[PDB]
């Protein structure tokens, strides 16, 4: 029957939806973001309600140049002081890691690296890497090379856990990027080689993405 | 983490809610019933979408003198042709068993009566009985007494199964009703005794329900 119907009681899944909704609400519509904030300050009592309000506020602030230090520091606080990693906090982190300072991001990453393995027995098995790469990108666009390299070394030591090759591809490619901006020896060779392996397997989407990135970095290399 | 988050894929749970929406839309709101039918004939392709469309059709038709024999026959069809019973169909049946012919209902009772035990290991543990009474009243309100007593005899045979005390109370009360309309021996005594036991424990809601029903039957005894 549906006794699993009772397993609806974990209906905080709605939060996930709302967040996700808001995550794309950020794209265009503003006034209903305002409505969102209205409703979520009507219900500003619980910690996750506060988290949601904080995120919507953050997005609204990037939309309208507003300062939002309260909500920013709140989110940073919450994500730093979480003990055990659940998908909720990984979603939240992946969403709002853009306004985070690289120290906080570094610490959060330092935390996920152990509680990650449940994604590795299990799209979502890539959520991990989807996080890692995101971080890396944000470091390279923030031009924090030592911290990026720190992530890379950490991940390469933790490459022992997952033998998935999209991982090793990304770490070698971004390593190549580091060498590229640092002006190292065979960096661009690594990058363009990985691009070559990407298009060779006729995986046109990913190859397009990473080629676009490499050419964007080359452009910014002015 | 949330690997139970992946178990969102059983998101046909929406149907339940949708159904539930209509369940209270039927009480008052018409216009969004019309909107519902609009959308559900817009999407009249899948079987449960068809089920929902049929239910909304049914409710709007009881509200607004429409015939809805087609959708009636559809619902009857679906509820006859399920092999193994799930909570979904208990919900659907409990919703639309009002416009049904007692024949289909009879077969449904013959089918659900075995698949009941998931409710019996397990509000919802009483849902089974919540269905039965729904049937029973509808039989007496349709004035089909022999069928009602027949069902009751079956339930008393299946009383061996569940030792829940709301059951024996209900069957004793309705048995009393049967004796009351057939004019059998000391029936109303049994009824008023059961009501008495209800009100003695100061559970006024249930006692109120069954007393108002009993007085309605007393009235119709003209």
TrEMBL record, chains A, B:
One of its GO terms (molecular function) is DNA binding. It comes from the Bacteria. It comes from Streptococcus pyogenes. Residues 35-211 form the HTH-type transcriptional regulator Rgg C-terminal domain. The chain holds residues 58 to 280 of 280 of the full protein. This is Putative transcription regulator. The lineage of its organism: Bacteria, Bacillati, Bacillota, Bacilli, Lactobacillales.
